[PDB]
Design a protein around this ligand. Structure first.
Ligand SMILES: CCCCCCCCCCCCCCCCCC(=O)OC[C@H](COP(=O)([O-])OCC(O)COP(=O)([O-])OC[C@@H](COC(=O)CCCCCCCCCCCCCCCCC)OC(=O)CCCCCCCCCCCCCCCCC)OC(=O)CCCCCCCCCCCCCCCCC
Ligand SMILES: CCCCCCCCCCCCCCCCCC(=O)OC[C@H](COP(=O)(O)OCCN)OC(=O)CCCCCCCCCCCCCCCCC
Ligand SMILES: NC(=O)C1=CN([C@@H]2O[C@H](COP(=O)(O)OP(=O)(O)OC[C@H]3O[C@@H](n4cnc5c(N)ncnc54)[C@H](OP(=O)(O)O)[C@@H]3O)[C@@H](O)[C@H]2O)C=CC1
Ligand SMILES: CCCCCCCCCCCC(=O)OC[C@H](COP(=O)(O)OCC[N+](C)(C)C)OC(=O)CCCCCCCCCCC
Ligand SMILES: CCCCCCCCCCCC(=O)OC[C@H](COP(=O)(O)OCC[N+](C)(C)C)OC(=O)CCCCCCCCCCC
Ligand SMILES: CCCCCCCCCCCC(=O)OC[C@H](COP(=O)(O)OCC[N+](C)(C)C)OC(=O)CCCCCCCCCCC
Ligand SMILES: CCCCCCCCCCCC(=O)OC[C@H](COP(=O)(O)OCC[N+](C)(C)C)OC(=O)CCCCCCCCCCC
Ligand SMILES: CCCCCCCCCCCC(=O)OC[C@H](COP(=O)(O)OCC[N+](C)(C)C)OC(=O)CCCCCCCCCCC
Ligand SMILES: CCCCCCCCCCCC(=O)OC[C@H](COP(=O)(O)OCC[N+](C)(C)C)OC(=O)CCCCCCCCCCC
Ligand SMILES: CCCCCCCCCCCC(=O)OC[C@H](COP(=O)(O)OCC[N+](C)(C)C)OC(=O)CCCCCCCCCCC
Ligand SMILES: CCCCCCCCCCCC(=O)OC[C@H](COP(=O)(O)OCC[N+](C)(C)C)OC(=O)CCCCCCCCCCC
Ligand code: SF4
Lengths: 353, 50, 175, 359, 111, 440
């Protein structure tokens, strides 16, 4: 049967597109853990994992298979709910945030004029997902870092949210594609350099990555909130943490570094000049270039996440709350009024085309 | 002294975005064009000589 | 009742694979043991002068991280427990509480003389004479302190044991 | 235990060996014996092995699971606890654990047949091979453990094979062998109690209406220890049980009431009235689909049979030990699973037991 | 009022993270340097002729044991890990029939 | 009491309570239901409030913590995040060293001192060697005392790398920990070449050293000295001027110089508070008078000051290492008295007098003339001293060891009171705790 096969793929192709999409994110997420130790290795004159798989490539899979196959510590015989809600909510929150990231022109699963709100809303759910981790499961180390955790990723969620809106104010749109496509002649790293630093500082603190890493303060709270978590609850939560590092790295490239836009349009046209536009081979290469353009930009921040961790000590917790409220908030509330003033003064109020 | 071993994980992460971008761009474009070829499957999938 | 048990059927560690299932459940055992062989996460239970060597393995010269070794502080996240240093009587009850909290599978490595059989302080009124009186041990590393390579050699030998695990074939053949 | 278990320092076995115990009974003391405890890695073995090693008797523990024998070596000193890898189908490995043994204890016994062994093949085929092989090596004493309701003509597979296990041993080891019948023992991770604590116990009414004579596992652990060091107790049959009679359904509500487990018992699955064919069908279906030992068809019949005391046998007082009651120890063994903790003392178990029986 | 760097100069260093960015760069220098790591067990670290490791009993080229059972061994040993018992051999030359070391009790002192 | 506990406005006399339908007493037996008839206001300071004494959150900074340098049950009583009372529980590593030394000779008791502090070995055994030398009334020759000065400095570099970098690591700076540990691997090579074992070098024995320096060691020691000078610079790059490192440590754990003397603090936590005292200068020993070096004194008595002093101790120690390599004299390395030192093996088998002293040294040991002594040296932690009583026997009678980490941990309550839980880690790190030395 070839008539019942060619139309069968026509009934299943879009599911495979998602599966191809799903694997695309997980591969980056899986190998961010491997890339972290390597990058943090040579920076410390170490070597990093090179003896688990050829040149250490099969290092994440070893940890995933090791952890997933351990005994699960439970308060009672059938008490799986408590040690699963915290990791599951955090994972789904950051997995759904990938429904809006566009890999190119309109290459997003969700395209709506409210992409920014949906992206920020899904961030809030993961925040609520984390505070469940340190809740009612006795009180030794998880509940110590839950009022501490909640008071941190609440406060910086203000500064992170304001930065997003200031970018969306410049384009007058809440659609990520419009934000990406509107940076053709300028990258918001040039005009909004302070915001990129403020965004990245808030991006680090929201994900609880060091230097703002008092959530899992290793020298203070053993393993922090994951001291109870083991085996699969640990994998889900750990996978949740790194998807944010990929997402926040990608978001920084989308907002300030133009997203999938090429570094140079001259080189970009030369490469696409070699492939006939009437054959599908052109559109395979085109997706690779635009996604690779986004990947290189997103790589540098994924490198930057490890880079900052290997060169900056941890920040005392009380100074974190006094930082965003006293310093970052007034600055981010000033550029939110500095931007409209300049745009209106020269009669350049933005519109959506 | 560029350590190429540390760059190995980034190449796969580079290929991580490419697989999503390469498949999504080519598959979505291919399907959309195919459905505009006509009002029926007998002409959608049959490449015309003329 | 009717019963007839053969006599020449060998033991599990000597029994060769015969049918295709004996290759299936050997694949699951190697794949599962390879995960535990590589993701070898001990627990930072440094107690005494032996603990200095356990740090020098993580140092850039040896770099335990290259082998997939990432020390985890909490017992729940750690599948190994390198008992390094003297185990005093005042510590022995606490050591048992830390060991019993490790989810299965779990291994214990005894590094140095004090952890093995008492060491220098074997005739002390407040020193456990060998931690083997408290927790089962899977490999003993001799030294005072064992050199940073001796611990790595002890780690490797235990790894060679883990790769010999035959749990999922044991269900098929010995259970 | 106390300070030294042996009645006399020098003991001569049935084989003419003259064993002299040394030391004051500590960890570094010895007794000159070599007690091979078959099935030592099990629930009962870990008590039999522990008592033998701490008093200086060499223990050879044949195992088939490699990761379960590691914890048995803590009890003894250096060289006291020995290990031999074996299977009941490997005759040569059996003779490795009896060559130097002066005491041979049999604990191997199953309730569920697997894809490699039947109930007969273990309670008989293992026992017959173990007993007969031990004799050929000049083993002085053999001790055996069977069911508490051994009967050659019983319709229950477990009781029928366990009874034949008594006959086939005495036709192989000979008059010297001893048979000990333990009542359902209760201890930490006791299979007798693990069924009562499980929340989702399908057919709970049917399974728990059976009657028993619960015995403390420590005393049975010492019961074999008392028998081991004595040659006067050859060729006997011992049934060990507790004075106060208890039933599972009496225990199950008594257990639940201590854990304080309104609407919850009606919903979580404490009481699951299911048809008798369904229970029979469910056990058969899992017998080919399960991979871990589940509830068996045999335990569906055993639930209809009550424990029977055999008068031809000998009680605890024959060995000089007074059996302990489940009332003095039931609370502590479920204390893991339970403002101000209420400790249900020995007498107060009756007052709990009173509250269960009152409608 | 007695600070050399003006208010704007201090603010720029403060707001633009001057020392952190310098701290990042110096770390990035080490990323382009050869790591110290060696590959055990395919390579070993250095050893010295004075290294104290596994105790071992030597032997003459003629084959006769070097040891004549001083019990100097049992006396010096700080951890009392040496156990010697000796008697006259059959040939009469003084040798030892028992010589045990409790490597779990030894401290690899070197005496 | 033990389980629970129980004014400005005028005490106002009000009696004769009445309503519109009677008196207070007429409806007294009914007004308990009427919540608006109660006569006990709840704002009154004398109002009877009986509340149980629920104890405050007492987290255990217990043995299984990476911050702990051993097994320390630091019972911390905290309300919120401030520190109310701290009661360290030392003893989880009491091996009973002081009890065992009484039964072993003076030569057999030396290896016990390398096991006190896991990182500062040759300084530890130097204080027992000096104690026995003081009682023996014998003085080490020149080249012996120069070897002890050189390895006195190398040990200080080894100890401070463990102290400073772990203090930096416990704050959160992981990178400087690994940069320095390669240097410790490079420095431990020198220990292994002269003595044989990487860490526990039973090298400095009473009466000089164990064996002469191997040829070419000075060349390798000096070559490391040139390279090592940059290693501090990068360490000062990621710590000294970083604002996050300053915030974590500045003003954290303030110790007054007058109050530091009261608790008997010594070492860095006595010059951190401003006192310019140093034992190497107050009591010169083992070719420390010959060399020149500058001591460091702080002014604020907080963790950042003690960091600067410890970093200065790196360069000053490296300064002496250059001087010790340059000014190295020739000659013997141990006292040429066969009664307190083994004779050379070329001479033991040739001279009847040599063999007798070799036989007698290792079976009976040498006898120390009666007396008592208390010799203190500048250990990397601080003032480390041993109290040794000689009973004319080949075994010491009393051997009490003063551990600088022991006294400092006692002053934890005085220092950490009023700080936050993250400041507890900073205070422990700057104390340079090694609980092998604390629980000797
Ligand atoms: C620039 C172009 C360099 C270049 O590409 O060739 C050199 C480089 C090889 O370096 P090399 O042969 O060792 O250099 C000679 C000496 O060994 C080099 O050793 P050296 O110690 O004598 O010289 C070191 C040199 C470092 O050498 C460099 O100049 C590299 C500069 C790269 C900077 C990138 C940013 O100087 C530095 O250390 C600078 C460090 C400070 C830089 C701070 C960053 C500021 C921005 O060639 C490569 O790129 C191959 C490695 C990468 C291969 C790509 C594929 C990897 C596998 C992917 C998976 C498939
Ligand atoms: C993302 C968008 C970009 C966002 C960032 C935009 C970057 C540009 C920032 C523009 C606004 C910054 C204003 C800086 C200009 C004024 C700074 C200044 O003059 O310093 C304040 C001054 C203090 O005087 P002082 O320098 O301390 O003299 C004594 C020296 N010992 O105080 C004074 O006396 C003069 C103060 C002038 C007040 C009006 C300004
Ligand atoms: N309170 C109680 O537990 C009860 C006691 N009994 C009987 O007392 C006896 C003691 O058993 P118990 O320890 O209590 O419970 P277990 O079932 O846990 O004891 C089983 C022991 O025998 C071994 N075993 C079972 N089948 C085999 C086999 N084919 N080959 C090799 N070994 C086998 C087991 O090996 P391994 O575990 O290593 O796989 C284990 O060592 C049993 O016969 C039991 O039926 C009677 C009623 C209840
Ligand atoms: C994607 C391909 C990655 C190959 C990595 C590799 O081949 O991984 C090597 C594996 C895993 O064992 P290892 O300890 O990493 O072996 C290498 C030892 N090193 C790390 C010290 C050098 O070993 C083998 O070759 C045996 C099995 C064949 C490879 C199985 C990989 C997983 C399946 C992939 C195809 C479905
Ligand atoms: C600050 C760093 C800016 C940066 O990374 O710039 C990177 C620069 C300049 O690009 P740009 O002018 O910032 O934006 C890009 C504007 N295009 C889209 C018109 C090119 O790329 C190169 O041409 C190389
Ligand atoms: C020209 C431009 C520059 C003008 C500088 C004026 C400085 C005023 C000052 O510093 O005001 C000082 C007062 C009083 O300070 P105090 O702590 O109460 O006492 C001072 C110390 N004593 C006790 C020794 C005297 O503080 C304020 O009201 C602070 C106002 C904070 C505003 C934060 C929000 C800003 C958001 C920005 C837009 C979205
Ligand atoms: C363009 C180009 O030739 O890029 C080569 C590419 C991408 O290199 P990468 O390893 O992802 O770079 C990582 C990005 N950094 C180096 C900026 C951090 O290599 C492959 O796709 C294989
Ligand atoms: C996707 C899945 C890929 C699995 C990669 C791991 C390979 C593995 O686990 O291989 C290990 C196992 C077992 O080891 P063996 O060397 O075959 O043992 C047999 C030794 N004889 C042949 C000398 C007797 O091999 C297999 O059972 C191979 C079939 C599975 C593929
Ligand atoms: C989908 C699930 C996730 C991915 C699954 C894979 C995870 C990694 C697997 C680790 C495997 C491992 O460890 O294999 C390596 C181990 C190590 O050898 P050893 O233990 O010393 O025994 C080997 C020596 N003997 C048997 C003599 C004692 O065995 C092997 O050499 C297995 C034999 C090589 C198999 C090559 C053919 C099969 C190729 C299959 C891939 C296409
Ligand atoms: C998920 C499905 C589980 C299948 C279990 C199974 O196939 O088991 C079926 C039987 C039963 O054997 P068992 O489970 O060891 O019996 C002991 C456990 N009881 C007492 C609970 C029954 O064994 C076989 O024929 C195994 C063949 C291997 C099939 C591939 C897996
Ligand atoms: C108009 C200009 C716009 C500038 C926008 C950017 C502002 C950013 C914040 C500046 C203020 C500040 O970092 O302050 C420092 C604050 C508060 O310090 P404080 O409590 O005042 O103590 C200082 C007292 N002094 C004034 C006496 C010195 O704490 C910190 O160390 C925060 C450390 C943040 C580290 C983040 C690392 C991320 C790296 C990202 C790239 C890899
Ligand atoms: S064995 Fe030696 S190095 Fe290890 S803790 Fe004991 S004394 Fe210290």
């Amino acid at each position: 049967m070839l008539n019942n096969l060619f139309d069968f793929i026509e009934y299943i192709e879009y599911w495979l597109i998602i599966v191809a999409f799903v694997a695309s994110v997980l591969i980056v997420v899986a190998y961010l853990t491997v890339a972290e130790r390597k990058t943090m290795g040579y920076m410390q004159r170490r070597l990093g994992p090179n003896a688990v798989g050829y040149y250490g490539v099969l290092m994440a899979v070893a940890d995933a298979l090791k952890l997933l196959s351990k005994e699960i510590v439970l308060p009672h015989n059938g008490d799986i709910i408590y040690v699963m809600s915290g990791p599951l909510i955090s994972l789904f929150s950051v997995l759904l945030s990938w429904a809006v990231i566009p890999f190119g022109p309109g290459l997003s699963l969700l395209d709506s004029e409210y992409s920014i709100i949906y992206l920020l809303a899904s961030g809030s759910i993961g925040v609520f997902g984390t505070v469940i981790v340190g809740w009612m499961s006795n009180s030794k180390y998880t509940v110590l870092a839950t009022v501490r955790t909640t008071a941190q990723l609440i406060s910086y969620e203000l500064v992170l949210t304001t930065v997003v809106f200031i970018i969306a104010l410049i384009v007058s749109s809440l659609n990520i594609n419009v934000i990406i496509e509107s940076q053709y002649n300028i990258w918001y790293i040039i005009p909004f350099f302070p915001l990129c630093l403020i965004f990245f500082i808030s991006a680090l603190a929201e994900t609880a990555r060091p230097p703002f890493d008092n959530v899992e303060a290793e020298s203070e709270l053993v393993s922090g909130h994951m001291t109870e978590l083991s085996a699969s609850p640990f994998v889900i939560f750990f996978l949740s943490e790194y998807c944010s590092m990929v997402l926040m790295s990608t978001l920084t490239a989308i907002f300030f570094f133009g997203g999938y836009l090429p570094f140079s349009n001259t080189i970009h046209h030369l490469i696409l000049n070699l492939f006939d536009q009437h054959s599908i081979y052109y559109f395979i290469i085109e997706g690779i270039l635009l996604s690779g353009y986004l990947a290189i930009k997103a790589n540098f921040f994924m490198f930057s996440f490890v880079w900052i961790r290997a060169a900056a000590p941890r920040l005392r917790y009380d100074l974190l709350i006094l930082f965003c409220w006293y310093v970052l908030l007034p600055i981010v509330f000033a550029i939110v009024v500095f931007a409209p003033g300049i745009l209106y003064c020269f009669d350049a109020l933005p519109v959506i085309i | 002294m560029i350590p190429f071993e540390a760059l190995i994980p980034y190449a796969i992460m580079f290929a991580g975005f490419c697989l999503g971008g390469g498949v999504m761009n080519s598959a979505i474009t291919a399907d959309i064009t195919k459905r505009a070829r006509g009002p029926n499957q007998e002409i959608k999938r049959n490449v015309g000589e003329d | 009742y009717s019963s007839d048990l053969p006599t020449d059927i060998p033991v599990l560690s000597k029994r060769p694979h015969t049918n295709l299932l004996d290759y299936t459940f050997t694949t699951f055992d190697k794949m599962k043991n390879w995960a535990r062989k590589s993701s070898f996460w001990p627990m930072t239970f440094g107690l005494a002068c032996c603990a200095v060597e356990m740090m020098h393995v993580s140092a850039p010269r040896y770099d335990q991280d290259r082998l997939g070794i990432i020390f985890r502080a909490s017992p729940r996240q750690s599948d190994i427990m390198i008992v390094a240093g003297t185990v005093t009587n005042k510590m022995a009850p606490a050591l048992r509480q830390v060991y019993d909290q490790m989810p299965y599978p779990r291994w214990v490595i005894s590094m140095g003389s004090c952890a093995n059989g008492g060491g220098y302080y074997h005739y002390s009124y407040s020193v456990v004479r060998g931690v083997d009186r408290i927790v089962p041990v899977d490999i003993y590393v001799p030294g005072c302190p064992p050199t940073s390579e001796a611990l790595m050699y002890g780690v490797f030998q235990l790894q060679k044991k883990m790769m010999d695990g035959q749990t999922h074939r044991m269900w098929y053949r010995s259970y | 235990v106390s300070t030294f278990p042996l009645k006399s320092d020098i003991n001569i076995t049935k084989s003419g060996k003259t064993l002299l115990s040394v030391g004051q009974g500590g960890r570094s003391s010895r007794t000159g014996f070599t007690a091979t405890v078959f099935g030592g890695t099990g629930f009962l073995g870990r008590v039999v092995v522990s008592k033998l090693a701490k008093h200086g008797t060499n223990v050879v523990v044949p195992f088939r699971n490699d990761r379960a024998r590691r914890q048995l070596k803590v009890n003894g000193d250096l060289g006291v606890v020995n290990f031999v890898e074996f299977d009941i189908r490997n005759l040569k490995s059996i003779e490795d654990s009896v060559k130097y043994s002066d005491i041979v204890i049999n604990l191997i016994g199953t309730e569920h047949f697997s894809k490699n062994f039947s109930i007969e093949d273990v309670n008989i085929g293992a026992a017959e091979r173990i007993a007969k092989a031990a004799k050929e090596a000049g083993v002085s004493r053999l001790i055996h453990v069977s069911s508490y309701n051994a009967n050659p003509s019983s319709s229950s597979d477990f009781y029928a094979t366990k009874g034949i296990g008594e006959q086939v041993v005495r036709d192989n080891f000979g008059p010297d062998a001893t048979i000990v019948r333990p009542a359902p023992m209760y201890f930490r991770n006791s299979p007798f109690l693990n069924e009562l604590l499980q929340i989702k116990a399908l057919g709970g009414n049917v399974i728990f209406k059976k009657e028993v004579y619960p015995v403390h596992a420590l005393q049975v652990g010492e019961a074999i220890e008392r028998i081991a060091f004595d040659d006067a107790t050859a060729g006997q049959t011992y049934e060990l049980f507790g004075k106060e009679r208890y039933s599972k359904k009496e225990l199950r509500e008594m257990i639940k009431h201590i854990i304080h487990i309104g609407y919850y018992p009606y919903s979580a699955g404490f009481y699951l009235p299911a048809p008798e064919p369904f229970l029979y069908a469910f056990a058969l279906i899992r017998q080919y689909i399960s991979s871990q030992p589940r509830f068996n068809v045999d335990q569906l019949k055993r639930s209809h049979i009550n424990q029977e005391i055999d008068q031809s046998a000998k009680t605890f007082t024959d060995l000089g030990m007074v059996p302990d009651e489940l009332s003095e120890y039931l609370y502590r063994y479920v204390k893991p699973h339970i403002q101000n903790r209420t400790v249900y003392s020995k007498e107060d178990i009756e007052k709990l037991r009173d509250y269960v029986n009152t409608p | 009022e007695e600070s050399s760097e003006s208010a704007l100069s201090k603010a720029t260093k403060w707001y633009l993270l001057s020392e952190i960015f310098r701290g990042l760069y110096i770390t990035l220098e080490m990323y382009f340097r050869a790591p110290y790591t060696i590959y055990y067990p395919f390579e070993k670290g250095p050893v010295s002729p004075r290294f104290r490791g596994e105790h071992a009993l030597r032997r003459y080229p003629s084959g006769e044991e070097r040891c004549i059972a001083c019990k100097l061994c049992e006396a010096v040993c700080p951890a009392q890990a040496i156990t010697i018992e000796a008697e006259e051999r059959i040939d009469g030359s003084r040798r030892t029939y028992k010589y045990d070391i409790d490597m779990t009790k030894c401290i690899y002192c070197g005496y | 009491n033990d389980f629970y506990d129980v004014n400005d406005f005028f005490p106002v006399q009000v009696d004769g309570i009445e309503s519109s339908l009677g008196k207070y007493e007429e409806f007294a037996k009914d007004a308990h239901e009427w919540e608006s008839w109660n006569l006990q206001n709840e704002d009154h300071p004398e109002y009877p409030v009986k509340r149980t004494k629920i104890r405050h959150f007492t987290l255990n900074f217990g043995p299984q913590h990476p911050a702990a340098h051993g097994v320390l049950r630091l019972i911390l009583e905290l309300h919120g995040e401030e520190i109310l009372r701290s009661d360290p529980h030392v003893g989880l590593l009491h091996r009973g060293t002081e009890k065992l030394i009484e039964s072993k000779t003076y030569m057999q008791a030396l290896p016990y001192f390398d096991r006190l502090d896991y990182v500062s070995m040759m300084t530890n055994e130097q204080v027992f060697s000096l104690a026995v030398e003081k009682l023996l009334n014998l003085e080490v020759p020149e080249r012996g005392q120069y070897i002890r000065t050189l390895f006195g400095e190398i040990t200080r570099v080894l100890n401070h790398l463990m102290s400073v970098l772990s203090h930096a690591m416990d704050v959160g700076a992981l990178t400087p920990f690994l940069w320095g540990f390669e240097e410790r691997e490079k420095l431990m090579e020198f220990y292994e070449r002269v003595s044989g074992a990487r860490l526990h070098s039973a090298y400095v024995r009473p009466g000089g050293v164990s064996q002469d320096l191997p040829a070419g060691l000075l060349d390798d020691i000096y070559m490391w000295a040139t390279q090592f000078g940059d290693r501090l610079d990068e360490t000062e790059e990621l710590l000294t001027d970083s604002r996050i490192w300053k915030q974590r440590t500045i003003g954290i754990g303030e110790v007054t110089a007058e109050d530091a003397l009261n608790y008997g603090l010594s070492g860095v936590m006595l010059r951190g508070s401003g006192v310019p005292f140093d034992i190497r200068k107050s009591q010169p020993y083992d070719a420390y008078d010959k060399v020149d070096f500058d001591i460091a004194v702080g002014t604020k008595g907080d963790c950042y000051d003690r960091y600067l002093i410890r970093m200065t101790e790196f360069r000053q120690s490296l300064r002496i290492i250059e001087q010790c390599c340059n000014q190295m004299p020739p000659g013997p390395v141990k006292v040429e008295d066969f009664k307190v030192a083994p004779p050379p093996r070329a001479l033991m088998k040739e001279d009847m007098e040599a063999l007798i002293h070799h036989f007698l040294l290792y079976t009976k040991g040498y006898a120390v003339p009666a007396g008592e002594t208390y010799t203190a040296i500048e250990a990397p932690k601080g003032e480390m001293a041993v109290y040794v009583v000689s009973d004319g026997s080949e075994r010491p009678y009393r051997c009490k060891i003063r551990a600088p980490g022991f006294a400092h941990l006692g002053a934890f309550d005085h220092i950490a009171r009023g700080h936050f839980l993250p400041d507890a880690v900073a205070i422990i790190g700057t104390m340079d705790l090694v609980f092998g030395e604390v629980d000797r």
